[PDB]
Structure formats: structure tokens, C-alpha cells
Subunit: 364 residues, 4 copies
Amino acid sequence: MKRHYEAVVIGGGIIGSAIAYYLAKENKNTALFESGTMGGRTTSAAAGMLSAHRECEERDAFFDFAMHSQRLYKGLGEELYALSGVDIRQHNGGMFKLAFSEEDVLQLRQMDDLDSVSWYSKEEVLEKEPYASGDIFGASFIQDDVHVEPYFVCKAYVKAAKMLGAEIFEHTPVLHVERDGEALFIKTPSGDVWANHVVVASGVWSGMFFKQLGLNNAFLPVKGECLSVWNDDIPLTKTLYHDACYIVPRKSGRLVVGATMKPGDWSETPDLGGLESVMKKAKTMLPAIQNMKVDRFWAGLRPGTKDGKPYIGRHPEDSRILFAAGHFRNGILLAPATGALISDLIMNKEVNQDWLHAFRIDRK
Amino acid sequence: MKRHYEAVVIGGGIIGSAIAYYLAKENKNTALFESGTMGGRTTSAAAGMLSAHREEERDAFFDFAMHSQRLYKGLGEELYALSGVDIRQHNGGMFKLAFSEEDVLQLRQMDDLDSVSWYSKEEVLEKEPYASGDIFGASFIQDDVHVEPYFVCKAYVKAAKMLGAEIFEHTPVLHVERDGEALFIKTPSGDVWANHVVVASGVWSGMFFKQLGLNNAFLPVKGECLSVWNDDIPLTKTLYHDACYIVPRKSGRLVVGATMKPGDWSETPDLGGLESVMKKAKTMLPAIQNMKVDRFWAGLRPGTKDGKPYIGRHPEDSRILFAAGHFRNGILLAPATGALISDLIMNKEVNQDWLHAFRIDRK
Amino acid sequence: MKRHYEAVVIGGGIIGSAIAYYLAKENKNTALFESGTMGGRTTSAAAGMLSAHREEERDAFFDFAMHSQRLYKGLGEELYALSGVDIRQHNGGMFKLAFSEEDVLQLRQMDDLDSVSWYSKEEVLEKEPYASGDIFGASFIQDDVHVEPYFVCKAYVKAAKMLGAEIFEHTPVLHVERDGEALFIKTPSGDVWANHVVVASGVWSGMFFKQLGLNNAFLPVKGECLSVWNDDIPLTKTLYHDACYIVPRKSGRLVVGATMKPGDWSETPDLGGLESVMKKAKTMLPAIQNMKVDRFWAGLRPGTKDGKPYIGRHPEDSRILFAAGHFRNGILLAPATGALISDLIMNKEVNQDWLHAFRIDRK
Amino acid sequence: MKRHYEAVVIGGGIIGSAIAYYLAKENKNTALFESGTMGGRTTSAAAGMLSAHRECEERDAFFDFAMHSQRLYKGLGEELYALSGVDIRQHNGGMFKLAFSEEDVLQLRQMDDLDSVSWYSKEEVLEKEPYASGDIFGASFIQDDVHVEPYFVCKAYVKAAKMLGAEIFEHTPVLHVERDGEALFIKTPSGDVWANHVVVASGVWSGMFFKQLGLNNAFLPVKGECLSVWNDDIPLTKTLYHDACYIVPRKSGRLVVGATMKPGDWSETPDLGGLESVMKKAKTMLPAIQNMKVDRFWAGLRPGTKDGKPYIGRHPEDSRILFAAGHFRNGILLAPATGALISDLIMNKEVNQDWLHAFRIDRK
Ligand SMILES: Cc1cc2nc3c(=O)[nH]c(=O)nc-3n(C[C@H](O)[C@H](O)[C@H](O)COP(=O)(O)OP(=O)(O)OC[C@H]3O[C@@H](n4cnc5c(N)ncnc54)[C@H](O)[C@@H]3O)c2cc1C
Ligand SMILES: Cc1cc2nc3c(=O)[nH]c(=O)nc-3n(C[C@H](O)[C@H](O)[C@H](O)COP(=O)(O)OP(=O)(O)OC[C@H]3O[C@@H](n4cnc5c(N)ncnc54)[C@H](O)[C@@H]3O)c2cc1C
Ligand SMILES: Cc1cc2nc3c(=O)[nH]c(=O)nc-3n(C[C@H](O)[C@H](O)[C@H](O)COP(=O)(O)OP(=O)(O)OC[C@H]3O[C@@H](n4cnc5c(N)ncnc54)[C@H](O)[C@@H]3O)c2cc1C
Ligand SMILES: Cc1cc2nc3c(=O)[nH]c(=O)nc-3n(C[C@H](O)[C@H](O)[C@H](O)COP(=O)(O)OP(=O)(O)OC[C@H]3O[C@@H](n4cnc5c(N)ncnc54)[C@H](O)[C@@H]3O)c2cc1C
């Protein structure tokens, strides 16, 4: 460990990893501190859908940033693979947003006008995925709402960063950021470090730093419980989606299935009721999944915010301190765009101003 | 691995392990052959309740079960002395819950028994305050205890080993040959002579029956299970209802099961099966919703035409014995099964009702 | 989660769990906060030997260790009654082997002790025939037993819970604030007042010392371990030598360790470390070569400047107590640690030598 | 389960799976029986090196068949991915066959003349892999000795086969093959099945069937113990090889490390001495591996034969019965060629005759 770095990233989930990579690409002398292991928390629980077309939202700055981050994924695997040897495991099968009611059709067809989205009838869906529940009314088909394996996106980024010269310290919690001196300094159990810039990327645990730094931004965990099966019997290429729940086909023959929404619950292992409700929901979407062998079960804490958007930007009173946290259901999608934005801000480059405003810290 | 043994045991689940111990205890130069690892199959999937009181009619089967339940009395200490292995015995007891009047009536027929009592809703809820508030009371059975089946199995085999028995894991027996003055079996590592052969291969035993001119068939009844951590509530007694159960282990885990899928040979749980085990558990113990899941698993109960095991001699050849088909009660029945098979080999006198009830040629 | 507790315990390893039980036993309205899961850290990685006889000099530390070893006497039954959790106690005892004359000499200095005897090569090999044939004999210590540390931890916490203590997993404490008429701590889920705060955060305790104007430092000494299945040989006693050990569990597993890597904060084993644990084990028990590996793991021993824990009051503030830095002996010391912290809070009189040896301001 | 199939494959390792796929491609009504799960035995233990240039052998029929099977891998992933959704996880990093002595150099340079093999000096190796042991004398570099994940090759094949119409029955041991009737029939615990052709592909357990069928072909298990680490710190693209031991970099950042040779040992979990010796050997090849975190440990039974080559072909007295078993250290490499050969023989196509002879059952 050195005394000084030009930039310091606090937290080693996917968000922190992207930032570290993107700073090291700019040849900034960078260090990242992580409590446990890289990707060991909410990043590991994640399904890895790169879904910008959710929750079929309004067309705002949040959506453009999503579409943009989705674009940045196009050569990302190849880019990071060349430097890290780590494959992010990209699957380009696409997505069916299923409908089970007339009200479902109606709401989904409010997107048909986007060029990426077309509408399929009951018959047209089943032509492509015969095992989709027979009770469906049709589906929104999205070509670009693909997926990746979040753990490995995280490992590709951090490995790539190391190779570009970044310093990674696992098992090193940051206890405090200060704040007063000419330079910033951070305290660890292995002693202190000085920095020209500090990025807080500690997901749902980021409140500590906000408060240490005179800010009242709070985070609310929303726990999500998932499970996986082995699909040894059925063809399934497209991700099936309904009402925030999903069945995601992996390149291994596993299906990733989720998920519960449990606000205020900080626990990181599934309880019995959670898994039960996930299993019940999955069968309505793909009946054949009931005969599939269970593989793993797990949970993770989505980092919730008061308005549901992340905080990505400078401390309103100190340009040296940045935050990148609060990616609720979409931290995997947004990881590259978050990483690029943070890096550009630190380099004093000019950034999209709608994005700066949307994810600013001081939102009154 | 020798050329000859006095006795060969084929299969190292709880049953085969037991037989081998009783044989070794009698100074019979004994070998055991197991395809995989000791206890690695159905034995591993079992909850380990010693429940004889399962009513319906009190026949030969019932006596044998009660006799075996008695045999578990000093077993733990006995095997621990020889093996260093704890069978993890738990003396809490069992409540067989009632959810209807029909339930109450059927359970009250065991009342005459000394080991059984009826409890009312209010009396059950004093003892287990977290049992479902929908219960109409429960049959309490103080002596229907539980063990950890894997460790009973490991205890026995390690004991037999200390008594001289030779154990061969990763050694499938391919054929038993009956023709000559002595028996022999075939394995991939060579062929071994024997004076007695015991077939203890659980649901896979059919292979050998057929080889030896008998048409005895086994049907697997797959059972899926899960465990949760009970970190929050007191629960001393096993809860039971309609063949499902919640069993508190001395680790703080709860063992919960089980499905019943006949004709399925798969040994890992399906999603639908695990879903129904969770549904059922919640009806017995509502708080189970909020307990963190630990593990999920499955195994194959060895079913037979009439529900009863085959324990005894080949009707044409007293050198050959079978010990397979302990449906929902293989753990309970293992000590008595072991002692019976051993006694028969040794030509001792045995209960002739038990001999008749578990015989090979039935119709 | 309430606004106020009489006592708050920060950390749920074996130590914090113990403290919480003793506090709850005294009817103190008690809360415990743990970052992860109860016992999920160093406590989980510990072998669980109760070894006080570790010579060198017999000081205050030694008495305390012996006192704690006495406290384990009815503990298992005591905690089982309240919790339903078995601490998995094993009374086999320990051989501290000798491989040289230097070895013999150093070990023979404990001879005067009543709980200790010397055995010759031939006497050790009668008892444990598989111990290395290179031994020059061993110090036998009948009462240096072992437990399963995770379950001692779970036993205590579940007991405290049954006595009224409120437990909060997944709840890191971020700050202790000292300024006002009463203490408070800060958590992500809100802030809580307290009359006493106990810091029991193992190797991570430094955070709090600093916050509270004290410069006490912790150095982790990582220890890597493995387990094998002993399916083939008798082994009742623990084997010990030069801080490495082989411990037989009542499951049939052997627990083997350990490395000593100071300044390493990683909690999973490296390859080099596991290689050296295997090398060492084989020198003590050659047959271990042929035993199938089960698991490998690691944890961080909480080291201090002088090797001793800090157990006691903030020298400036009697509302604040510390219980951290039990280097190689946190499991052994947990009952006495729990009773000491509890007694201090309750203002009872305590051994003043022990109070002095484990005090916070040392130099 | 049906009464009759045109062909029946006994055993569901990689060999059996390839055969099932290749028969189903020819639209033969096919069934495969497996005791446990697909790929659950020796196929799962395997490293997945597709190495034809071992043990730097003589240039014979065995070698050509290997080179050929290696060629068949070129579009195999894409071929099977289109039908199964399962990625075989192909890595094209290549191989260094390291030398630690003058005798090592000498023996390795007996291959320089092959166009696929060039020689690197100590310096040239370290230029590419700085972490290779400094005690090396140089290395044979092989561009095409790539690798795959054997479990998934096996799953891709079996899934592809199902889609082509094949019937897969896991948890169904074959008890007996007979033999006498007009048609062949096999006995399972779920009852009997008739077949026009029977393929024995039961790896190291195949002796049973040879003997049931009047043949004395024996198999000797050679147990192999392996472990994996996480390489989070070091660049490593090339497989390192020395004296039958190996460090294989996976696309996940794991390194696969092996292996012991234990003849006559039928056990399928590592013992302590085995793993110790694997760890000791690995450090001499890549010193930095000693600081790497352990992940998994496992073992498998190589299916040995009297002469070290497999048996791939017809029963010398019955054209309806075939065997494909005894791929010692190279079943993953040879899986496609074995599958193609068996299928062609069953279809009475004309096959390479040197290959037929080399792997014939009756080798006196
Ligand atoms: C079941 C589930 C499914 C999901 N599926 C998707 C999906 O399909 N697509 C999608 O885009 N998103 C998904 N998400 C959301 C996604 O997981 C999150 O938005 C994202 O992982 C947040 O990334 P992060 O790096 O901010 O958080 P984390 O991965 O939680 O990382 C934060 C890191 O900071 C570390 N840290 C905390 N405190 C400190 C400290 N004091 N010092 C040092 N380090 C510290 C933590 O240890 C942690 O490793 C899902 C979430 C769940 C729960
Ligand atoms: C309280 C209680 C709870 C129970 N719960 C369950 C439950 O939840 N689920 C359930 O399924 N059952 C349950 N059971 C009962 C079940 O009967 C036992 O779990 C099981 O019967 C053990 O019987 P076994 O030793 O005959 O079979 P197994 O344990 O299956 O052992 C047979 C052994 O034979 C070996 N073998 C087979 N063929 C060969 C061969 N050719 N050569 C060499 N070896 C061979 C196999 O490898 C296997 O290890 C329960 C029983 C009780 C009493
Ligand atoms: C026979 C024997 C064998 C042993 N073997 C080993 C061994 O092999 N390896 C080894 O490493 N040690 C070993 N030990 C001894 C070791 O001292 C114990 O394993 C350990 O000390 C338990 O101590 P603890 O409860 O203080 O720490 P831990 O078990 O580490 O518990 C501290 C807890 O505090 C929590 N925490 C930390 N910070 C916060 C916060 N800010 N807010 C809330 N919670 C927090 C952590 O989550 C952690 O769970 C052994 C001891 C004995 C007696
Ligand atoms: C540590 C190790 C590393 C290796 N690395 C490599 C490598 O890098 N490259 C390479 O090319 N090779 C490697 N190998 C070799 C390779 O694993 C084998 O050559 C290959 O897997 C053999 O394939 P198989 O399908 O014949 O055998 P298996 O995968 O063993 O399959 C045989 C199947 O038949 C089934 N079966 C058995 N009996 C019956 C029955 N009676 N009824 C029904 N089914 C039955 C079994 O259950 C099993 O699933 C390695 C081996 C080991 C042990």
C-alpha cells in the first residue's frame, strides 16, 4: 500500500470496478478498497439482464442513460477480454415481456413505436418458445435486452484495471473519509491513504459516507431472492419477463429465476417463503420448469433511493469527492455508463448535462 | 482383498452396514462391497425418525418395528465405543398433529398404547407454542425419537471394521453365481468366493433377485427434502402430519419433508416438489416462512409390491440372504434387520412370525 | 429494534455471544449487533481445543485460562437446556508430541501439574498406534478437550435470545458516540441509546478504539485449515506439536491446522498454505496421506502488541467495555470473558489480577 | 420408454453423448442410458486440453486420429450451440510444453519439424508469460493445442441430440446385454428394451459388458486428482505443461491444475497426499500460484487399457454390437472422432481403415 493515489474508489462491486478500470485507462494512479472480495455482494446476486425497457417507464434522461450504457456493452466483452482473460459470458437471445391480461397487452403496446420493440401474438410467441405458458395474450419482443454474467463483468473489469496499473485491496474496509486537509485521506484497518479524488461506490452501504461527509442521502435495501435450475429438456433462447419477475437462460443450460422484493430487509440469504413465491411465479410463466432440477438459491440487497434513481456525481460542496451508488434494479446495465461518467467528471471532461442533473446528489 | 470370505454383504447403506457389524461381532470373517461411498444413497436422504407408531393395524411388522426401536436403546454408546462416531440421538419426541375431527378419531385409536397420549390444542400449544393454531390437538409419542442416519451408518461400518470386517467402497458387485459347492461374486477388481452372500442394495436390489431366479421387484418412491436454520424459536418435538414432518436437529437445523414420487429414479429435487414441501411445512409451523434455507436434497425409498421389506433367505438356497425394501422405515428397522440376518446366517433360532412376514416368496 | 437498551454488544463471534448471554442471565435488557451472521468469522474457522496447557510461564493469563476451562464443565448441558443446541463436546484429551530431546525437556516442565503426565514413545503408541513412529513420547493432558466453536456460539446466542436478548444480524455498528449523559451507537437502520456498550468485534475492533480516543491496534494472524475423513483408523486423542494439531471430531472428521500468516487479511486459504498444513500433518500422523479431503478454510486470529486480549473498561469511561484480541485461545476464553465483562457491568467484585492483565492501557 | 430403438448407447459420458448426437444427426431412432447424470463421472474430472502432441509420441494412426478429432472441433461449438443453447467454452490460448533440463529440450525439439510446433528460448517464453518458472530452459509452443470445458461439451452434445430426437434416460443403469435373439435387448431396472445396435460407452466400467459378451477386454482405472485456484493477479494465456502435469487458464479466471497418476485406485475423491503432490508440482511450474486462493479439488478415473489405446469398433463376432471405451488421458480430444467413427460404422459407411485397425477389439 502506498501513501498517495490520484484517485481512490471505495467499494468493489460492479460499479466500483468499472470506475477503477475507466480511471486506469486514463492512466490515473488509482486504488480500490473493498471490505470482502470483488463482486461478493449485490453484484453476485444479480441476474445480468441489460434491460433498458423497464419498467416500461417514461422516456426521460434515465432512459437515455440506460440506452447509452446498453450501447457501451457492444464491444465491452472483447475490450475487457483482451486485457483480463475474463469472459463476461454475453448472451444475445433477447426478451419476451409476456402479457397475461388485456390490461397487460394495453400497457406493453405503449412501446410498439420504439424501433427495438415489436409485438408478438400468442401464436407468434409460442412459435418461438413452445414452452411459454399457454395463458399468455402475446408479448413485447425486445431484440437488444440481452444479458451477461454480473460476477464476471465485475472480474473482467477489475482484472483489466490491475493490468492497466490499478491497485486492488480486498479485505480492506474503509472506516472513514476526511475531508479537511489539503488532500483527502481515507482510514483503513491497515492505516491511512491520501487521495486527490475519492469515489464512493459502496452500494447499499454508502449511507455511512454520505453522513460522514455532511449529507443525508439514505439507502433502503430491497432484498431479492433468486434460484437457478438445470434446463436439460426444453429449448429456451429468449428471456421471459412478467411483472418484475424473470426466467433467464444461461449459456450453461442453467435458468436464473427471480425475484422477490423485500424492502427494509438487510439479510443476504433466502428464507423459505421467499423461494416458495419465486417458484410459484415461475411456473405460471413456464409450466415445464416445475420438473426441472434445482441447482442454487441466493439473495442480494438492491440499493434503494428515495426517488428510485442512483446518485452519480460530485459532492455539492467538494469536487474531489464523488458518489456512484443507488442503482436499484439496474446496476449491471448501468455499470459502464456510470464508470465512464465518474471518470470523465474526475478528468474535468465535458459530460452530458441531462445525465449530470438527473443523478446529482442534491435532489430537493 | 482376499480370495474367500465367510460372508459377503452387497451394499453399504444403513442396512448393509448393520448386517456387517452384527456378522463381525459374531467373529464371521466378513466383507462388504459398496458401489459408491458408505451411506451415499437413500440412507443419506433420510430424516432419521424412529417412528413405529404410524397407524394402521398392529401386526408382525409393528412388533418388529417396536423390537428395533428397543435395540436403539444402548446402540449409540455401543457403537461410539468401537467407532468414535456419534449417531446424534435426540430424545425430544413427536407430536402427530390433528387438523380435522377425522384426524382426531384416527389418532385416538393408538390411545390404549402406554407410549402414547392425546393432547388437546391448548396442551400442544403449551409445549410447542409455535405449532399451527389450526390444530385440533396432537398424539404425543414420547419414544419416537430421531438420529442422523448417515452417522448411524458410519458408526456401524467403522465398528465392524474395528471388529475385522473388510470394507470395499467403489466396488460394484456385478454378478452373484450360485452353481458350485461355494458361492462367488464378480467385481471389476476380481472375483471373490463366499459361504454366505447378503443382498443389501436398497432399491437397486432387483438386479440380484433376477440373476438368482426370483422375480422380486422394487419401485422407487422418490422423496424430496429441505433444511432451514431455526435461529429464532424454541422447538423440541418433531411435528408430523399426513406423512410430512419437521424434525429439530441438535445443530439448530430443521429437517423438512417430504414428497412421494413413485417411479421416479432421479436423486435431486425438482422445483415443483420443493415448492410443495414448503407449502406443507407452513401449514404445520407458520414461522417457518422466515427461516433461512440451508439445503435441499432427495433420495429413493425402496418400495415393494406390498409395502414390506424382504428380509431372509433365498427359498431355494440358504447360503443367500436378502435385506431390501424398507420403505419409509429403513433407519428404524436397521438394527433389528442386522440382528435377524446375522442370526439366520449363524443358524440361531429367530422369531418365526417376523421370519414369515419378511420372507422372499410372497403372494 | 428499540430506542434504548441497558447494554449493547457490538460483534457476534463467540465472545460477543457469550457476553450477551451472561448479561441476559443477569436480567439486563440486552441487544447484540453483528455485521454478518452470528459466528460467521474467526469463530467459524477455529478448531475448538480447550488448551490452557500451552507452555510458557504460569501467570495471570494461565489462571484465567484454567478458570475458563473450569467454566466449560456444565456449559454444554446449561446451554442445551435453553437453546436446543449441542456444543459438540469431546473428552478424548491431547497428546503434545515430542520429536527431539529439546522437545522432551520443554514438555517435562509441565510435569508437576496434576492434569499432565509424560508418556514414552511406547506408551503413546499403545494408546494411539498410528501416531508417528518418530516421536520421543508425548505430554498427555487429559482435560484439554475440544468443542465445535460455531455451535458454542449458536448455543449462547439462542440461549440469550430465550432470556430476552435481542439480536440483530446484518447490522453493522458504524460509530459509538461518547458525549452525552448516555451513550449511543449509529447503524444503517438507525441509532440506538445505551447505558453500556461492549466492543466485541474481534480483529476489526480497532475501528472503535480509535473512535474513542484509544490507539489499541490489532494485527490479523491468518490461519489456514483443512479437514479429512478418518474412515479407517482409531484416533481418540488430539495430536499437537509446534502449534500444529490434528483433532478428531465426533463425526469421523479430522480437523487439521494451521498456518500463521501475520498481516494477511484474506479469509480463504492460499495454495502454499494448504500445502504446508498437509506436509506437517503427515509428520504427526503418516496415514493421513490416504484420507479423503473434506474442506479447506481460513480465518483471522485477532493479534495484539503483547499477545494478550483487551478485556475490560475504557480507562476514561466505565460505560464502555472491550473484549477483543483472544489470539489462539478465543474459544477457551469465551466463558470467562463473558462472565468478566458481565460482572464488571453489574459492578460486582472481580479478580483484580485478571482485571489488570487484560486492561486497555498497557505499555 | 419405448420397446424398440434402432440404436442404443450405454453410458452418458462425453463419448456416449457424441455417439448419441451423431446417430441422431443421421436420423436413427436412438436412446442413451446412463446410471447417474450426464457427464457426472470421468468426463467431469477432465481438464479439457485438446492435445494431440502428447506424449510427444510416435507418428502413427493414433496421432492422425487425434489430429483429425482436433480438426473436427473447429466448428463444433458453433454447430452444437445452434441446437442446444450450450456453450462449450472454447479457449484458443495455446500451449507451452516447458523444459527444465537439457534432456527435456532434446526430447521436445524432436517435434520442431511439425508446422504447428515451434521452439521458444527461456527469454522468448518469459516475454509471453513472465510468471513461468525462471528455471525453465525454453518451451515447445503449440498453437492448436487449445482447450474446452468437458462437462459442457458433454451437455451441448446430449442437449443437441435430444433436439434431434434422441431419448435420454438418466438414473437408468444397464444391467445386461443379450445377445441371442433376432434383435439385441438390454435390461434396466425399469424393464427391457430391444435394439438393432448397441454401443458400449461406459468408460472405465465397460469390462462388465465385454465379459457379458464373451470378451476378455479389461479396464484399469488410473485415478487423477486435480484442484483449481483463482488467478486474480497474474496474466496467463497459455497452458503450461510439463511431464504430464498442467496449469490450464480458464475463461473464468480459474486455473485448472493437475494431475496425479494412481493405477488401480477406483476412488473418486482426492486424498491428502495426492493434492499435496499436485500443489508441489504446480509451484515448480508457476511460482506465483502459491499465493493464489484455492477453489475446488476433485478426482476422476482415467479408463486404462492393456496397450494404452481405446477400443472403438464392432464386436469381432457381431456387427450389431460396438464399443467405444478406453480413452486414457485423451477422451475429450477424441470425443468427436469417436462419435463420428461409431456412427459411420453403424450406418455401414466406409471409414478410414488405419483407424478401424488401430482401435479394433481383438488386439492379439
Ligand atoms: C436478485 C437481484 C437481481 C438483480 N438483477 C439485475 C439485473 O438483471 N440487471 C441489473 O442491471 N441489475 C440487477 N440487480 C441490481 C444490481 O445487482 C445492483 O444494482 C448492482 O449490483 C449494484 O452494484 P454496486 O457495485 O453498487 O453494489 P455491490 O455489488 O453491492 O457492491 C458494493 C461493494 O462495496 C463494498 N463496501 C461496502 N462498504 C464498504 C466499506 N466501508 N469499505 C470498502 N468497501 C465497502 C461492499 O462490500 C460491496 O462489495 C439485481 C439485484 C438483485 C438483488
Ligand atoms: C425416520 C425415517 C425417515 C426417513 N426418511 C426418508 C426420506 O426422507 N427419504 C427417503 O428416500 N427414505 C427415507 N427413509 C427410509 C429409507 O428406508 C432409508 O433411508 C433407506 O432404506 C436405507 O436403506 P438401504 O441401506 O437398504 O438403502 P441405501 O441407503 O440406498 O443403500 C443401498 C446401497 O447399495 C449400494 N449398491 C447398489 N447396487 C450395488 C451393487 N450392484 N454393488 C455394490 N453396491 C451396490 C448402493 O450404492 C447403496 O449405497 C426414512 C426412514 C426413516 C426410518
Ligand atoms: C482450540 C482453539 C483453536 C483455535 N483455532 C483457531 C484457528 O484455527 N484459526 C483462527 O483464526 N483462530 C483460532 N482460534 C481462536 C480465535 O481467538 C477464535 O477463533 C476467535 O477469537 C473468536 O473471537 P471473536 O468472537 O472475538 O472474533 P470473531 O469470531 O471474528 O467475531 C467478531 C465479530 O464481530 C463482527 N463485527 C466486526 N465489526 C463489526 C461492526 N463494526 N459492527 C457489527 N459487528 C462487527 C464480525 O462480523 C465478527 O462476526 C482458536 C481458538 C481455540 C481456543
Ligand atoms: C484428472 C483428469 C484430467 C483429464 N484431462 C483430460 C484432458 O485434458 N483432455 C482429454 O482429452 N482427456 C482428459 N482426461 C480423460 C477423460 O476424462 C476421459 O478419457 C474421458 O472423460 C472418458 O470419457 P467416457 O465418456 O468414456 O467416460 P466417463 O465420463 O467416465 O463416462 C462413462 C459413463 O458411463 C456410465 N456407466 C457406467 N456403467 C454403466 C451402466 N452399467 N449402465 C449405464 N451407464 C453406465 C458412467 O456412469 C459414466 O457416466 C482426464 C481425466 C482425468 C481423470
